[PDB]
Amino acid sequence: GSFVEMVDNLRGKSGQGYYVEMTVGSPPQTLNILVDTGSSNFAVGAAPHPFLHRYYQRQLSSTYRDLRKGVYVPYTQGKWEGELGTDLVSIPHGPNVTVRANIAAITESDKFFINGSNWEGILGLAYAEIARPDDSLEPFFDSLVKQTHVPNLFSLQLCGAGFPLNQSEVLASVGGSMIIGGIDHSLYTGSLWYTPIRREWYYEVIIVRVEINGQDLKMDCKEYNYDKSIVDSGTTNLRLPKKVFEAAVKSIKAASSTEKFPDGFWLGEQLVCWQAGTTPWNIFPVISLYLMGEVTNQSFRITILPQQYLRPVEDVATSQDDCYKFAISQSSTGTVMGAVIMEGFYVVFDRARKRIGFAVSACHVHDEFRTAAVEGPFVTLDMEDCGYNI
Ligand SMILES: COC[C@H]1CCCN1C(=O)c1cc(C)cc(C(=O)N[C@@H](Cc2cc(F)cc(F)c2)[C@H](O)[C@H]2C[C@@H](Oc3ccccc3)CN2)c1
Helix, strand or coil: CCCCCCCCCEEEECCCEEEEEEEECCCCEEEEEEEECCCCCEEEECCCCCCCCCCCCHHHCCCCEEEEEEEEEECCCCEEEEEEEEEEEECCCCCCCEEEEEEEEEEEEECCCCCCCCCCEEEECCCHHHCCCCCCCCCHHHHHHHHCCCCCCEEEEECCCCCCCCHHHHHHCCCEEEEECCCCHHHEEEEEEEEECCCECCEEECEEEEEECCEECCCCHHHHHCCCEEECCCCCCEEEEHHHHHHHHHHHHHHCCCCCCCHHHHCCCCCEEECCCCCCHHHCCCEEEEEECCCCCEEEEEEECHHHHEEEECCCCCCCCEEEEECEEEECCCEEECHHHHCCEEEEEECCCCEEEEEEECCCCCCCCCCCEEEEEEECCCHHHHCCCC
């Protein structure tokens, strides 16, 4: 590990998001910020809200600059409205630099802030193409790279605990690492495999094959990327296009048929519980997603375990049972490789070389019999045809 200052700088969990501490303004105002590779706006609460115990106070920053323009961002789930401006921003446990970046001061919001999440803003790390109001509003990472010598790359190690974390614990626990400008070798085991960033807007990739316990889902690969597939730390679940979800659930149910679960479980709505320590991990299948490789007709695969797609939750009766919710759900906007997927790997967002790397995470949850994996190469033909075009 060559970036000790940034290792273990994240906190949080799937379900509420992973966040990093940042400062805005002069003198610096400390705020916890959700790391979101699924959007491109840097926005922070800038007015009182029931779920915030602190917020950005522009009138107290001598370096605040008003851009005199409104901004509105309606995410798939959640939305906010605010006022644009710029100010000096730093990341205490990050590169030792300070940059002037665009900041959306949130004045109104609906289902955006989460009670007890401990974060007060969001850091959209994707590209300008999807920034609101439009691509003229330079994203934070673009500003960072343009104003400093920080390499154009960042990597994320999101660490799920494998069990529920109460309010006290989640605040004291290390949730992972965001290495700005590099790759820390202590955060992963094995080799890093890279898939091309198809287009620079979201971090879009192309899935070329899907397996459930080695069994080919057998769908036209175009379906897997309809209408796109993205790597998104801002979304908890692995979300799959309607038809893929239906096929995947049917196959996962078949593989785990020795136990019957209620429909509410498969809809990702209700939890299932087992006596402490008896979760039957072995009856659930591993899921492999093959991604386009960097070499022609070559692919590699990432394999996750039920320890990744079954999200630990506290029992309603706060009993001693180990409970979980199915963290795979339906999408109408393409595949979303969310947090529960990212928790199994160290993910390298290599913007400079337009590629995303994957390696087995040093902090992924597993058992004595199976582990997550990143393997390759595999001969795969006509992978370009797996990509969707409107
Ligand atoms: C971590 O999970 C935390 C849990 C708690 C509540 C949110 N959440 C989810 O798992 C979840 C579920 C869905 C079906 C959508 C989004 C969603 O829209 N996420 C966005 C970020 C976000 C928004 C919030 F209001 C609250 C958050 F905690 C996180 C991404 O940018 C998504 C949205 C889309 O990209 C867009 C869409 C519109 C504009 C710009 C980008 C693809 N990336 C997030």
